[model samples]
Target: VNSFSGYLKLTDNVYIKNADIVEEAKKVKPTVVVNAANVYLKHGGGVAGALNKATNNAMQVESDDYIATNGPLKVGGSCVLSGHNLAKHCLHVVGPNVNKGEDIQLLKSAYENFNQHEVLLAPLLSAGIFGADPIHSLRVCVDTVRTNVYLAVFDKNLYDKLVSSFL
Candidate 1:
């Protein structure tokens, strides 16, 4: 499946974006952008990696530094930092890994930990290798957000699923 480039509108200030996560995040120019990284804050791949590059690579080192400073981020936890070149600030969360018997509550808490921001650019955390259903993950994010905002269709099928699920 392909990652479609378009959007499904939810409201004047809310919409479900598809295609190019980084591009959409930039377009949104959110006040707070969320990253789906591990507890160690590794910028290896996925959302963190994309935003790392978007922020001119400093986010990668800063993330590592943050880990060294405060230690590994606990599950269901998060931290606030500079958004680098993208937004005003960035919020990184330790997404729960279902394969490791992690619960959805952890993921929900991680997302909920920083919903105070107005414009938020976030992904469907834990829906990738972390092993949560994409639709369910999408629901978690939208529900956690509560303000109605949003992408996440990493693929065309997932986009379709998102539309069918809650739009």
Candidate 2:
């Protein structure tokens, strides 16, 4: 697909990229791609819905099973699913449904749950339908997730906004 790509080095270990998540996931073949989901693990909208379809609907089944056994996931909690159609692993995190500034701490905590991996793909959590600030959510991802992070996006306008926020 037609998409722009760039990088922002947030730290020595963490970096952010502006690219399509699905495209980046295919190119980088990351060990795990994080999916922003609700507590119920329903892939109804946004990144979670996209991932659910991309992974051949395996993510949804696995997530449902996980929630059934573990109960509803908390805002900062996450679960890992394997045998995905694209990435080697998929991490589903329950992000907060709050305003821009309020969800930063919870977003940080969600990113904290991510384990070390060679490559990890994530999105601007809570930034789309969840209604958090894209730049702030991305910054939290960069700040907390201490791995080689590829922050993927599809919208050129969103990418520009993210870049402008950094400058």
Candidate 3:
């Protein structure tokens, strides 16, 4: 995922983890991309069943870096800080459940083609993981845009540093 993000001339490779998404991206040639959501455990977050927890301690780091590097094209869940920091545009797609297929699908469709309807420096997506339903956002992103995603999982320290740097 790092290689691909760099290949696209993106500034950060912080959004690459699930190899499965990378494998899928190779097939498509999308210029811009968006990511879905899912809980991310930073290798040390714990090895138990930590899947149920929100592990994005580094979200601010990646988000800030991404905005700093790429001119801010971040969009994701209901977190206000994440949405506000992004340089260009930001949106919040609230979901009731991961299984809320319709709402998820609409968000995917809207974001994937966001650029077509508006002018911007570039298009991108940032996602966070937590209890409500992260993967649902991911599913919408992947199902609609598939290979164009640049996904990241930000641990707490990274997130703190990211926000602090901007301040």
Candidate 4:
């Protein structure tokens, strides 16, 4: 689809895309797809929901037991799902709920906990449903990760803003 067709570089290893995240998933076939989930590991909305659907609900099943035992992951906490349908693994990270305000530190903490991988695909964490400013959210994502970051975005305006602001 046209929605998943453009890209811009922010840094050597960081990028912003005005495209469908699923299309990027198909193209890159990344080793990891970061799922921004709640402590209960619900993947029913935003990027998490889309990823869960794309992977045929594999993430939900893989995370169920861990979440149950762990009794809800704190912000920045994470769990992993391997041998999944879309990628070899999915990194399910607990992100702040919408009520938490724009906590950039928690968002950065999520990125800090990520296990190193060759390729990582992520959405604009905290920017969407969590209500954080998109630009600030993108900045935190780029600033925190050591490896390349491919941030899937749907809106051209946000994409343009990020490109101009950082590139």
Pick the TM-score winner: 4
Clash counts per candidate, in order, are 0, 0, 14, 2
Candidate 2 C-alpha lDDT tens digits along 73-114? 888778777737767888887777785334556877787876
Candidate 1 structure quality by residue, lDDT tens digits, 1-167: 12223667654544576665687767656677778878888887777788898878899888888978899888888888888877778888787889889877787887676566655666777877778887777667666765534554567777776787774
Per-model TM against the reference? 0.83, 0.84, 0.28, 0.85
Q: Write the per-residue lDDT of candidate 3 for residues 60-161, one digit (tens) a residue.
A: 344445446545332233222232122212222232223333333335544455323222121122333222333344444445542333543234453333
Model 3 scores a TM of 0.28
Cα displacement (Å) at residue 146, model 1: 2.5
User: For residue 93, what is the lDDT in candidate 2?
Assistant: 77
Ranking by TM-score: 4, 2, 1, 3
| Regions of model 2 farther than 4 Å from truth | 1-10, 99-104, 115-118
* lDDT of candidate 4 over 1-167, digit per residue (tens): 12223556677677677876766776767777777777788888888888888878877887787767777777877777763666667777775665666355788888775536656777877767877778887777777887777788877788878777773
lDDT of each: 0.73, 0.74, 0.31, 0.73
